[PDB]
Symmetry: C5
Subunit: 86 residues, 5 copies
């Protein structure tokens, strides 16, 4: 698994299993990181493209501002959001 | 070929798509407004044009819709 | 005289006399289409109010769609530039 | 000296002394035009976080470059 | 130390240690400048969801790169240790 966080050009933060072939990024199990509360901030993962059943999503790398590896806290929740556990 | 395009402007559009050259031609295009009930409304209400062309650089993702979305789109 | 509607990348809808030479669009008598309600009515207002320029040039990369307007919209546009 | 108004791709309207060398625009004395509600325009410094005299933007980040109405040049001139 | 302020294409203003190799900008210790309310500024970490020390952005996503006023560097420096 290559789990990374993409800041999109639309402003959102996406988290998923990423592979970069050609000039395209293929994303599996993609979630948007929605923060919220002036008290502590709880991060919420929700499915990025709720209007589709597609397993893989392709975006051109031009539509991504940064690709970044998540804090351990965030990978654990992502993992428990997508798979079966220890 | 009914697909859902997330535009660079943030919107989600649904329509009959064909990709020739580096352009996408869209027939019968609707914007998906959520509020959950999803509502389809005509994308470009200011025009009678049957086909609309966008450069693919202005689309973030092209994705195939869930069955209930297709049914509603069809019924429109 | 070619009147079309351009959806800009900034979100706005512009209407004007359009000519496409090189990879640039030249626009004459350009108006923004502002809609509103409280029957949804459309209002045309000058696109670039800070200038007297008769022609404005935009790279076509900043336009999402170029589309021919409904008859009602042309009539109002025609009446607005008179 | 060449005072023009640039609509940026971020939405803003900037006014400044513009020179176009290479595919880059260099701006001196740059102000953002903020309107508010007979509409009143206010010029405020574009980049308040810097003392730089010249600022460079790639022309792909500019939607239009346009010459200002006389009333706007006068105010700009008096702002400097 | 090359501390600069980048206005991104998404609207934000970032401050950090910048190096430009290839057509990419590498940023170390990056903070967003949030203003509020006298002009009043807060520096907060730009990418809070990551531990990465370096962040790479294509220069096409940056509108302007600009050197900060002295008081902004001093805060940035005191915010970085």
């Amino acid at each position: 698994k290559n789990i990374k966080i993409m800041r999109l050009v639309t402003g959102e933060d996406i988290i998923g299993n990423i592979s970069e072939s050609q000039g395209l990024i293929t994303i599996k199990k993609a979630f948007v990181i929605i923060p919220m509360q002036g008290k502590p901030v709880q991060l919420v993962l929700s499915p990025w493209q709720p209007y589709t059943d597609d397993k893989e999503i392709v975006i051109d790398d031009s539509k991504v501002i940064t690709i970044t590896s998540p804090k351990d806290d965030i990978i654990k929740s992502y993992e428990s959001h997508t798979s079966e556990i220890i």
